[PDB]
Design a protein around this ligand. Structure first.
Ligand SMILES: [Ca+2]
Length: 380
């Protein structure tokens, strides 16, 4: 089993590796002095989840009306900067602000855990030590360079942090100094953050002026077997198969490769995705985040949102509504923690108990509209 007694020898070993890669002993002592193993970070790894979260729950929180209103506020406030970012990297401002909204809520996301604690612990314990050692050493190089200046910086357990939720190795490779002050500051500089977001997408293959894709309508008998991010066909093949834009307009046709996504079955919402969707997808390597960015970018361009409905009687609910649901559960005597809007195991267990009590099916523990409307009390 992991034991805290091994941590000092592990940290001392990493000092020699750090020195070999140009991190000074002074830097290493300054940034790692009083680091302690936090073995609780391993509780979040190779943890089998008890609950399944469908795509429409991710989208209800990532693309909620507050995310859309906040994004339109940022497009207004940062208009001139965003034009300069688009001019310098060839990525449109709606895409850049959509990524900023989904990844960090425009730089407002609470980092639960100190970066250097998570990464040093994961460098010394568990089954991914070599990977996390690279991330740990990349963080120390960024601190030595003064790109990062807060050794107590917080982020995800896996080391994603700042406006962009880059991991340290991504930060090293992709971060830009947009404002030209000699610092690549993705924590405190909105210019550096938006420029780095754009640079990430450019490096991932973004084609200037091309769409991510769009929502489409497929015919009743469209074969679900043809769908998937990996299964591209020329647009002419999709036209031949009766695929159309959701407003009935034809596709462009010709020879450009595109995939159809049917994340919720042959008559659920359908998406035609181009190479720029693949660039977006690379940021989180998860359809939930990739379609959140694409659909938020559609809302920020003044789109009304998804035309098709998800196959549920229980639509997802906003971040504000998740807080209302958590307050409702606390009011009914479920000790689920703070009403922070994060739907974790404690909340989902209380939802499932209420679903079974109320005869709601499925008793899936989802934070959906059905349980919200059932449990809301006074002044939600
Ligand atoms: Ca800068």
């Amino acid at each position: 089993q992991p034991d805290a007694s091994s941590f000092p020898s592990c940290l001392a070993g990493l000092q020699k590796k750090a020195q070999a890669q140009g991190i000074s002993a002074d830097s290493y002592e300054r940034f790692t002095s009083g680091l302690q193993a936090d073995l609780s970070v391993l509780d979040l790894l190779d943890a089998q989840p008890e609950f399944t979260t469908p795509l429409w729950d991710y989208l209800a929180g990532l693309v909620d009306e507050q995310r859309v209103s906040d994004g339109k506020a940022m497009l207004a406030q940062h208009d001139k900067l965003l034009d300069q970012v688009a001019a310098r990297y060839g990525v449109d401002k709606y895409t850049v602000v959509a990524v900023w909204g989904v990844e960090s809520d425009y730089g407002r996301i609470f980092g639960k855990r100190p970066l250097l604690t998570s990464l040093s612990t994961l460098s010394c314990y568990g089954r991914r030590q070599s990977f996390f050692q690279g991330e740990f050493l990349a963080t120390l190089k960024l601190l030595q360079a003064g790109d990062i200046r807060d050794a107590g910086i917080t982020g995800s357990w896996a080391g994603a942090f700042g406006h962009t939720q880059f991991m340290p190795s991504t930060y090293a490779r992709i971060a830009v100094d947009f404002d030209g002050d000699g610092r690549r500051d993705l924590v405190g500089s909105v210019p550096d953050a938006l420029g780095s977001t754009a640079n990430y997408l450019k490096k991932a293959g973004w084609r200037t002026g091309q769409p991510w894709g769009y929502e489409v309508k497929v015919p009743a008998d469209f074969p679900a077997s043809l769908a998937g991010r990996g299964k591209r066909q020329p647009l002419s093949a999709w036209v031949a198969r009766g695929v159309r834009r959701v407003d009935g307009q034809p596709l462009p046709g010709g020879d450009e490769k595109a995939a159809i996504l049917l994340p919720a079955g042959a008559q659920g919402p359908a998406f035609l995705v181009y190479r720029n969707y693949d660039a977006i997808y690379s940021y989180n390597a998860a359809e939930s985040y990739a379609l959140a960015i694409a659909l938020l970018s559609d809302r920020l361009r003044g789109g009304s949102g998804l035309v098709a409905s998800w196959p549920t009687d229980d639509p997802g609910i906003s971040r504000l509504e998740r807080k209302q649901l958590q307050k409702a559960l606390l009011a009914r005597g479920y000790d689920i923690g703070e009403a922070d809007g994060l739907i974790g195991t404690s909340t989902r267990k209380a939802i499932q108990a209420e679903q079974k009590r109320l005869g709601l099916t499925p008793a899936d523990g989802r934070a959906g509209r059905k349980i919200l409307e059932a449990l809301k009390g006074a002044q939600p």
